[PDB]
Amino acid sequence: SGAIYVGNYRVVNRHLATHNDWANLVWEDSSRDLLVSSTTAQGCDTIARCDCQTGVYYCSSRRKHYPVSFSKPSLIFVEASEYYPARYQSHLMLAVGHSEPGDCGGILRCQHGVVGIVSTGGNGLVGFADVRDLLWLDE
């Protein structure tokens, strides 16, 4: 579990979004596994605007932060699950590192700010849903 709070926005994994998230929907994209809902309180997370390929992510299944090298956002095949059928998930970045399903929502950060959130994993890999292209999160 986990979310990004920027301005009057809450960014979460679409497969973990609550009734309140859907009742205050701003934008959602199942191909990216992202959902953005509105908030009453102001958010103070800074979103990165860069093409960094190194950063640090939080892994709740180990209560640790890990440094990683990750690929640029791209279309990656993701096997069928209880939330989605087998499909290509877009804007997804992969790294070699530990992850378990409950790790989804953990933030990936570079020196410029928040890059994305954990969205996939398995077989010694971890996938992150990129958020750097969503320029409207700032305005």
Ligand SMILES: COc1ccc(Cl)cc1NS(=O)(=O)N1CCC[C@H](C(N)=O)C1
């Ligand atoms: C051992 O499997 C995991 C390990 C770590 C992690 Cl973050 C996840 C899994 N399962 S998973 O199949 O990647 N995952 C399940 C939840 C929805 C994801 C999606 N974005 O379509 C896909």
Ligand SMILES: [Zn+2]
């Ligand atoms: Zn950066």
